[PDB]
Amino acid sequence: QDNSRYTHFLTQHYDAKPQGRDDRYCESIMRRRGLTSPCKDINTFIHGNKRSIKAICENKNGNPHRENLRISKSSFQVTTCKLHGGSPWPPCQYRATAGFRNVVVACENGLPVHLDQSIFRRP
Amino acid sequence: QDNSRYTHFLTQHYDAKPQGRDDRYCESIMRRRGLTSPCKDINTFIHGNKRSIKAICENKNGNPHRENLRISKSSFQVTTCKLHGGSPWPPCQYRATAGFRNVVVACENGLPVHLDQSIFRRP
Amino acid sequence: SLDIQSLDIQCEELSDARWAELLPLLQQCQVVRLDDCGLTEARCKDISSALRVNPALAELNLRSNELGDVGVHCVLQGLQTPSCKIQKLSLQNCCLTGAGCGVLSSTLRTLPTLQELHLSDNLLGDAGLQLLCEGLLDPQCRLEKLQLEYCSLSAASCEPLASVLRAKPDFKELTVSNNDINEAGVRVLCQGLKDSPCQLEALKLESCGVTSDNCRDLCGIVASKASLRELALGSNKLGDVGMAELCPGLLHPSSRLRTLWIWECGITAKGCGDLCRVLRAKESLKELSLAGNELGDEGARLLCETLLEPGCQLESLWVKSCSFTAACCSHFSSVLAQNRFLLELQISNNRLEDAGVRELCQGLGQPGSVLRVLWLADCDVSDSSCSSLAATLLANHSLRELDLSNNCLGDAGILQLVESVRQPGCLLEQLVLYDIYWSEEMEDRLQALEKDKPSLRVIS
Amino acid sequence: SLDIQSLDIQCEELSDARWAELLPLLQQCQVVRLDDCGLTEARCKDISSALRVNPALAELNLRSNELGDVGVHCVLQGLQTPSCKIQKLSLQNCCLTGAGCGVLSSTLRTLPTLQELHLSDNLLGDAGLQLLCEGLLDPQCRLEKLQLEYCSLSAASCEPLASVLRAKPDFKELTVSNNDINEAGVRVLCQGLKDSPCQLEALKLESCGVTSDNCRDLCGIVASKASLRELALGSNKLGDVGMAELCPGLLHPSSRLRTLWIWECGITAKGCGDLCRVLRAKESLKELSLAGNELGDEGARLLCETLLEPGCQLESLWVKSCSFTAACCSHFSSVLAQNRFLLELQISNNRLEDAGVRELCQGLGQPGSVLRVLWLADCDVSDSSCSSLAATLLANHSLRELDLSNNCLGDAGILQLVESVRQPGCLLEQLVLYDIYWSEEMEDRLQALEKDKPSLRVIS
């Protein structure tokens, strides 16, 4: 894996070519990524090419804020999957919300290792 | 000719070479014979030659009686396994009891299809 | 005597090389699950042929593969054989359509061993279901459990379903969540259930257009079906009125309902009160989901009073996003110190802050406390509560799972937790920390933990 | 994502041919159970080889095979890779002697993932168990469940065992049933427990030589270990005295014991009365085995009175061979008609007669009755009770399993039961008819029923 912490990031938040941006896509990608046991309440996926994301961890497309938290310059195609159900246990049901917005990530060694999920709660 | 009912009988009541005749043996032969789910309360195994068992059914090894209930003219080496535990569910613990007795079976078409387990309840 | 083999592959495409090795197993496993494996109508022939010579097949699960109407027809042909003993079949999300229900109808008629069928997430529509009900109504069909979520059904499907129910007394579960059957359909379905002699055990009508009126209908099913154990009605605009309408049946002495799901049903503190009359009178109710209802601290208040009274033996309570604030924590703290039945409490997505959490921690840290799972995700927790949580983890001995996801906890707060959890005297087995930022070092220490103490899973 | 495979072979001679076909599976299965498959010390080398390249292995069960200290040494080596994450290992009845406990002691310290070990039915001796505990005391040993039934241990082993207990805070289960550790051993053990910080969940000392005296020690453990869920003391001469000494610990408000096995402990109606006080006070006690205690209809009356009192929420009651007669059946009939918590009743080996049984059926046919499993084997029932039984099988809807073994139910009686069980309105799933004679005509009748209603299993 490419710098584990960064690879962990890509596994949880990156889908180059979504091929679906609906409830069905969410239910499916969450499972394939292993964020379903237990059900992860909220997860946002960034689409497009990786280089664009990397860049955020610099000043070509990124821009500082707080705890190594950079709010990207450019906007990204994203899909946020939100848990919609009665219990915290699987099977996990997700409602998908597609958007085109800038992301906020934490950078370490010039690589994104954390996605701030808060901004994706309410639009 | 060995067939179904007779075969079922041999499966549940016939063990040619005892290869031991204590608790250990019982606990083991019972699982082996599928009389463990759930725990059969009591079960007697007849040892020795298969054909001397068959004889009982047609004035050969056993005098003819009622419902074709018949007692064997000679004594057989037998081992009786008794359920020793606090629940009807497996694992099943058994206390073995060996003896040399006449056996009483139900005969059909000259074949033993049922062994009377009640005479084995008391040593 | 025995030879039981199980194959369960999930989210991973095989490849003709891997697929080649897997084929002979398909001939001997009693349980076969190929979930989301990129199976194509092409490999369905292998499956069919291998399944034909499989004398032990008891369960077949092919969920999330693009089989299509023809692909399914293909696999089902490997099952129409006088030796097949299949008991459970799932074709969930397999691109099946109304036209694929013909094959399904025949199979059902010729497989009396099959008791459970999962057809969720396939656009069957009313036309498809109608065809399906023809095999279901066959006297040779012994199906007892049917799942039809996201199947594109309308109120039109309720008449045929009601007729199957009225005719199969050994029917146990009907799940029709996420289909817009609405008030008309729900009422019909209910008529079928009341007239039916079936000992239904589970009914799920989540996001089905259920209304308050339907509640008088449901009240009847609940009051009379003594076999009913689970009723899921989440995501239905039932309201406090529907609540009041439903309660009388739950109190019926014959009812032994164990699980009730009424999340996001628009219930406020008022219907909560009605609900509480039930909780204090029925020791049979063990699980209750109230997530997504604006109950407020007034609602938490009522709940907590009930949880401290005799008669209430609720084991799991899910109250995520119920508009609770730090103010209700003093009451929850009392339940956690006193109550000896509640083992699972989900209070995530409630603004309890470090104040409320410190208090919850008080009650939990008491002796005899029995809580086993606590979800405090997104609860406004900071490095501030981590000292109280750290201590509680050592004071308390019942917790086995803790979820602190999405909390502005920091490197500082995490350390404190890593400290107690390392202890051999801490018996926690799972700690969920999703979306929480921590440095490479904290990260390091976390992987230390995972290696030193293998009995504990640290999630993300 | 996932690729889970398991192999469970029980009582089957394999053959070098089939043996070769199974080897590759041992390399990829997460669970491997080769129970009584005639494995030699030769096939052990094959096992060790596949095991060490298997990263998946979580459970290995080699129960009942002539392995020996040699073959077990071989198999154990395969678990020597730093990729090993085995969690459950059973080497029950494997011909392991005390000389082989050395390797085991050695491996135990290098397997921090291993949590459960079954060594039952091996003549280990106090010598062997001594070596073993040396490894167990190793801080790298994370064992939580140990089973040592029939291991030729004496009171000598209890001190070492007490030392491990006193040392490991997460020990959860200890089973030393069927070892003559006697009063002394049981005393030492209770000492190590009374002060260990472990949250023991299960303690089994059946046929251990426990005396009514040890009942005071046990009373202390019960009173203080809130984590204790299961206590097995069957086949020990405790008597009505021991019982009186144990009850006070059971009445403790901190004790939440769920299962109590006191079969063949020399109790009578007298001790049964003490026990009844506990029952009406603790709704936590769900399972109780009183089989083999001469309680008589007098003890049955006490039980039934408590079972009707609110507070007793017992779910399973095994009272086989308790000297009950038809006289108690009017009472048990009341409980079955009223009690909403009891689902399992074993009254086997009691002379209930056709009269007692026809009385039980009345309560069972009441609307709302909940019993699921009823055992009436060897109860002096005949064709006379069969019309009553057949009617109740259609009147009651909760019953799922019925055992009428060793009863002189005739072709006439069996016929009546078959008519009922044939109906779809009969939800019974299991019918046990061991050692009962019926003709070939009835045999066919039953076989027909078997093919027609596959959901129902008729045992022998």
Q: What is the CATH number of the domain that holds D257?
A: 3.80.10.10
* Residues 6+ positions from C353 with CB-CB distance below 8 Å: C325, C326, C379, C380, C381
Cβ(C269)–Cβ(C295) below 8 Å: yes
Say which residue the tokens 């407020």 belong to: C296
φ and ψ at residue D298, rounded to 5 degrees? -70, -40
Say which residue the tokens 């697929």 belong to: C19
Cβ(B30)–Cβ(B94) below 8 Å: yes
* Residues 6+ positions from C343 with CB-CB distance below 8 Å: C315, C316, C370, C371, C372, C373, C398
Say if the Cβ atoms of D439 and B108 lie within 8 Å.
yes
Nearest chain D Cα to A31, which residue? D1
Query: Taking CB atoms and an 8 Å cutoff, what residues of chain B touch C4?
Result: none
Distance of alpha carbon C44 from alpha carbon D294, whole angstroms: 62
Distance of alpha carbon C355 from alpha carbon C345, whole angstroms: 18
Nearest chain B Cα to C1, which residue? B32
Domain interval for residue A1: 1-123
Q: How many structural domains compose chain D? A: 1
Name the residue among C314, C262, C243 with its Cα closest to residue C283: C314
> Which stretches within D52-119 are classed as H helix?
68-77, 101-108
Name the residue among D81, D232, D268 with its Cα closest to residue D149: D232
Distance of alpha carbon D260 from alpha carbon D286, whole angstroms: 8
Distance of alpha carbon D322 from alpha carbon B54, whole angstroms: 38
Distance of alpha carbon D401 from alpha carbon D427, whole angstroms: 10
Distance of alpha carbon B58 from alpha carbon B64, whole angstroms: 7
Query: Residue D375: helix, strand or coil by DSSP?
Result: strand
The residue type of B102 is N
Alpha carbon of C148: minimum distance to chain A alpha carbons (Å): 15
Query: Residue C152: helix, strand or coil by DSSP?
Result: coil
> Which stretches within B14-88 are classed as H helix?
23-32, 50-55
Length of chain C measured in residues: 460
Q: What is the resolution of this structure in A?
A: 2.0
> Which stretches within B14-123 are classed as H helix?
23-32, 50-55
Name the residue among B47, B62, B41 with its Cα closest to residue B110: B62
List the Cα angle B63/B65/B66 in 5-degree steps. Answer: 165
Say which residue the tokens 């008309």 belong to: C184
Please indicate if any CB of chain C lies within 8 Å of the CB of A44.
no
> Which stretches within C317-397 are classed as H helix?
329-338, 353-364, 386-395
Q: Detail the DSSP E strand segments found in C36-106.
A: 59-61, 88-90
Query: Taking CB atoms and an 8 Å cutoff, what residues of chain A touch C346?
Result: 87-88
Q: How many structural domains compose chain B? A: 1
Asked if C touches A (at least 3 Cβ pairs < 8 angstroms), the answer reads yes
Distance of alpha carbon D418 from alpha carbon D431, whole angstroms: 10
Q: Alpha carbon of D70 to those of B16, D8, D96, D101: distances in Å?
A: 31, 24, 9, 11
Distance of alpha carbon C449 from alpha carbon D137, whole angstroms: 21
Beta-carbon count within 10 A of D85 CB: 17
Distance of alpha carbon A37 from alpha carbon A53, whole angstroms: 27
Distance of alpha carbon D209 from alpha carbon D50, whole angstroms: 43
Q: Alpha carbon of C451 to those of C437, C440, C444, D86, D141: distances in Å?
A: 21, 17, 11, 14, 14
Cβ(C315)–Cβ(C342) below 8 Å: yes
Q: Detail the DSSP E strand segments found in C216-297.
A: 230-232, 259-261, 287-289
Please indicate if any CB of chain C lies within 8 Å of the CB of B31.
yes
Count of alpha carbons within 13 Å of A28, Cβ hemisphere only? 21
* Residues 6+ positions from C391 with CB-CB distance below 8 Å: C361, C365, C420
Q: Does the CA dihedral C437-C443-C445-C450 come out positive or negative?
A: positive
Say which residue the tokens 């009171």 belong to: D155
Query: Taking CB atoms and an 8 Å cutoff, what residues of chain C touch D141?
Result: none
Residue B38: asked if its preceding bond is cis (omega within 30°), the reply is yes
Distance of alpha carbon C406 from alpha carbon C380, whole angstroms: 9
Q: Does the CA dihedral A30-A32-A36-A40 come out positive or negative?
A: negative
Distance of alpha carbon D349 from alpha carbon D378, whole angstroms: 5
Residue of A37, A41, A43 to mutate for C, most C C-beta atoms under 10 A = A41
Structure-block tokens of residue C307? 């949880």
Asked if C touches D (at least 3 Cβ pairs < 8 angstroms), the answer reads yes
Alpha carbon of D16: minimum distance to chain C alpha carbons (Å): 16
Cβ(C5)–Cβ(D8) below 8 Å: yes
Length of chain D measured in residues: 460
Distance of alpha carbon C9 from alpha carbon A93, whole angstroms: 21
Strands B69-72 and B104-108, bridge-based pairing = antiparallel
Cβ(D379)–Cβ(D356) below 8 Å: yes
Name the residue among C247, C338, C323 with its Cα closest to residue C285: C247
Distance of alpha carbon D210 from alpha carbon D205, whole angstroms: 8
The residue type of C138 is D
The residue type of D98 is G
The verdict on whether A84 is a catalytic residue reads no
Residue A18: asked if its preceding bond is cis (omega within 30°), the reply is no
Cβ(C443)–Cβ(A6) below 8 Å: no
- The distance from CA A3 to its chain's CA centroid, rounded to whole angstroms, is 18
Beta-carbon count within 10 A of D82 CB: 6
Nearest chain B Cα to D64, which residue? B28
Alpha carbon of C73: minimum distance to chain B alpha carbons (Å): 37
Of D2, D12, D454, the CB nearest to C8: D2
Strand partners, C116: C88, C145
* Sheet containing A104-107: order of strands: A69-71, A104-107, A112-115
Alpha carbon of C144: minimum distance to chain A alpha carbons (Å): 21
Distance of alpha carbon C3 from alpha carbon D9, whole angstroms: 4
Domain interval for residue C173: 1-460
Say if the Cβ atoms of A118 and C405 lie within 8 Å.
no
Distance of alpha carbon C328 from alpha carbon C304, whole angstroms: 9
Cβ(D397)–Cβ(D365) below 8 Å: no
* Residues 6+ positions from C339 with CB-CB distance below 8 Å: C307, C308, C370
Count of alpha carbons within 13 Å of D401, Cβ hemisphere only? 15
Cβ(D11)–Cβ(B31) below 8 Å: yes
Say if the Cβ atoms of B88 and D375 lie within 8 Å.
yes
Name the residue among C280, C216, C272, C275 with its Cα closest to residue C242: C216
Structure-block tokens of residue D178? 């069927």
Name the residue among D191, D142, D199, D206 with its Cα closest to residue D172: D199
Distance of alpha carbon D294 from alpha carbon D286, whole angstroms: 22
Of D8, D12, D226, the CB nearest to C368: D226
Nearest chain C Cα to D313, which residue? C283
* Residues 6+ positions from D60 with CB-CB distance below 8 Å: D32, D33, D51, D75, D79, D86, D88, D89, D90
Q: DSSP character for D36?
A: S
Please indicate if any CB of chain C lies within 8 Å of the CB of B65.
no
The residue type of C87 is Q
Distance of alpha carbon C307 from alpha carbon D460, whole angstroms: 49
List the Cα angle B49/B50/B56 in 5-degree steps. Answer: 100
Cβ(D250)–Cβ(D257) below 8 Å: yes
Q: Cβ-count burial of B19 within 10 angstroms (0-12 exposed, 13-18 middle, 19+ buried)? A: exposed
Point out the residues of B that are catalytic. Answer: 13, 114
Name the residue among C129, C126, C124, C86 with its Cα closest to residue C107: C86
Beta-carbon count within 10 A of A22 CB: 15
Kindly report the CATH number assigned to the domain that includes residue B27: 3.10.130.10
Distance of alpha carbon D318 from alpha carbon D439, whole angstroms: 32
Cβ(C220)–Cβ(C203) below 8 Å: no
Q: DSSP character for D223?
A: H
Q: How was this structure determined?
A: X-ray
Cβ(D337)–Cβ(D369) below 8 Å: yes
Structure-block tokens of residue D268? 């009578």
Cβ(B52)–Cβ(B44) below 8 Å: no
Structure-block tokens of residue D120? 């039952």
Q: Considering only residues 166 to 205 of chain C, which have any Cβ-Cβ distance to chain D shorter than 8 Å?
A: 168-170, 197, 199
Alpha carbon of A32: minimum distance to chain D alpha carbons (Å): 6
Of C375, C406, C437, the CB nearest to A114: C437
- The backbone region for B4, taken as left when phi is positive above 0, alpha when psi lies in -120 to 50, beta otherwise, is left
Query: Residue D187: helix, strand or coil by DSSP?
Result: helix
Cβ(C167)–Cβ(C144) below 8 Å: no
Distance of alpha carbon C379 from alpha carbon D145, whole angstroms: 36
Q: Alpha carbon of A41 to those of A86, C320, C341, C413, C430: distances in Å?
A: 12, 11, 26, 22, 17
Name the residue among C454, C447, C430 with its Cα closest to residue D140: C454
Say if the Cβ atoms of D8 and C4 lie within 8 Å.
yes
Structure-block tokens of residue C187? 């009422």
Strands A76-83 and A69-71, bridge-based pairing = unpaired
Say if the Cβ atoms of B115 and D435 lie within 8 Å.
yes
Longest CA pairwise span in chain A (Å): 43
Length of chain B measured in residues: 123
Query: Residue D271: helix, strand or coil by DSSP?
Result: helix
First vs last C-alpha separation in chain D: 43
Query: Taking CB atoms and an 8 Å cutoff, what residues of chain B touch D206?
Result: 86
